[PDB]
Amino acid sequence: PPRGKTVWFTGLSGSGKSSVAMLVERKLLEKGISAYVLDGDNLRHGLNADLGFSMADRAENLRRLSHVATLLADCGHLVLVPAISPLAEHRALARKVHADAGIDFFEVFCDTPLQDCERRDPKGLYAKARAGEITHFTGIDSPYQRPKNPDLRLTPDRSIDEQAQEVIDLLES
Amino acid sequence: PPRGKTVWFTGLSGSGKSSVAMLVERKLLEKGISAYVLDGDNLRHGLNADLGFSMADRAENLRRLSHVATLLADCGHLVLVPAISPLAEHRALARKVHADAGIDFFEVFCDTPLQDCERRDPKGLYAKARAGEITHFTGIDSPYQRPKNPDLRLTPDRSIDEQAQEVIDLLES
Ligand SMILES: Nc1ncnc2c1ncn2[C@@H]1O[C@H](COP(=O)(O)OP(=O)(O)O)[C@@H](O)[C@H]1O
Ligand SMILES: Nc1ncnc2c1ncn2[C@@H]1O[C@H](COP(=O)(O)OP(=O)(O)O)[C@@H](O)[C@H]1O
Ligand SMILES: Nc1ncnc2c1ncn2[C@@H]1O[C@H](COP(=O)(O)OS(=O)(=O)O)[C@@H](O)[C@H]1O
Ligand SMILES: Nc1ncnc2c1ncn2[C@@H]1O[C@H](COP(=O)(O)OS(=O)(=O)O)[C@@H](O)[C@H]1O
């Protein structure tokens, strides 16, 4: 097989990481490209069921995710990782795990304003955080460090379909 | 893709787990069957780099490995897991993670006697353990519970090639 590669999505909760990732996955699969979405949230329920949201656990979650991505990539998949990845050092770690495994690594920043993300508020998490029912929530009372150099920055200027198509164009260029 | 399955190898250090697993991988791949080895020792240098050989770390190591296997299996691979898995409960846990994920799970016991494993001694570890330079070494001063009912027991009667073929025959029946 060709060895695979990893697309790592960072951004606020509700910024479109999973949507874009899922759509990219379908588009690729429809053209016989074996793509797989390795979702921070889903893994948190099995492999990463023992971790929370302290910066240390998130780093651990993400460290683990980064390894699993390189493993799926080594099996020949195009891996899509939507995960908040709130700190530069989180992304720097993932990148280094990929460098060390000799797997191509692309960073995509889903740069949707906080306003838009909670105007969306799809799982009700912003509301809970503003109410004090969740704490250390990214963008509210836990920081989000903006990537300075992503491979691609997505903005809420276009449809999810078209955002997926930009990810694909990044991969095919 | 149809869903993959897992072959889980248990046995003493130097009993042939990795050798058989690698050879099974190659044989399968040469026939256009997508196979992948998750080797305990290799992954201890990345995903599981944070774990040692306390019984607790070994359980965690093997818990993690079991989740990764099911996930690669779900992607359609035939997953080969050589790892000592020294306790019955370790194997029972992996089996359950697989049952729960609806992935077929086969247990292979590489039943080479301690004496033979020591007499092989490929990485010098038994010697270090006898000398007191390593502690909690499986079979010397850390236990190995022998599987009561593996799907396949491999014995030092055959070449590694032939042992691989038996694993394959097990899968193809
Ligand atoms: N470019 C876009 N245009 C319109 N709506 C979007 C866009 N990106 C995301 N959305 C909507 O906003 C929400 C983003 O949620 P999701 O992708 O789950 O965010 P995340 O995975 O980053 O937490 C979704 O309901 C999606 O429908
Ligand atoms: N059936 C066999 N016949 C001959 N040699 C074997 C057989 N099984 C294993 N070996 C040898 O014994 C050693 C087992 O090593 P390995 O597969 O690394 O064990 P483990 O992964 O179980 O530690 C290897 O050096 C291999 O050369
Ligand atoms: N305190 C929190 N901050 C951000 N997300 C949270 C928090 N608590 C729960 N979550 C949930 O966990 C998901 C984020 O998971 P990841 O992307 O795996 O997080 S990350 O920070 O470690 O990268 C969010 O989509 C949200 O659904
Ligand atoms: N104390 C030890 N006990 C057993 N194996 C060890 C030990 N220290 C280092 N090793 C090396 O680590 C490998 C064992 O790793 P695992 O298969 O991952 O162990 S397991 O118990 O957690 O299943 C061995 O093949 C050997 O190379």
Numbering used by the authors:
A (entry chain B), B (entry chain A): 440 to 612
Sentences from the paper on this structure:
Alternatively, APS can be phosphorylated at the 3′-position by APS kinase (CysC) to generate 3′-phosphoadenosine 5′-phosphosulfate (PAPS), a substrate for sulfotransferases that catalyze the transfer of the sulfate group onto a variety of metabolites. Structural features typical of APS kinases of this fold family, including the P-loop required for ATP binding (residues 452–458 in CysC), the conserved LDGD motif (residues 477–480) and the lid region (residues 552–581) above the P-loop which closes upon substrate binding, are also found in CysC.
To obtain more insights into the active site of CysC from M. tuberculosis and modes of ligand binding, we co-crystallized CysC in the presence of ADP, APS and Mg2+ and determined the structure of this complex. The overall structure of the CysC protein core and the subunit-subunit interface in the ternary complex CysC•ADP•APS is similar to the structure of the binary complex CysC•ADP. Superimposition of the individual subunits resulted in an rmsd of 0.9 Å. In the ternary complex ADP is bound in a well-defined conformation in the canonical nucleotide binding site in the vicinity of the P-loop and the enzyme-ADP interactions are well preserved compared to the binary complex. We note, however, that in spite of the presence of 2 mM Mg2+ during crystallization no electron density indicating a bound Mg2+ ion is observed in the vicinity of the diphosphate group. The phosphate group interacts with the side chain of Arg483 and the main chain nitrogen atom of Ile523 and the sulfate group forms hydrogen bonds to the side chains of Arg483 and Arg497 and the main chain nitrogen atom of Ser524.
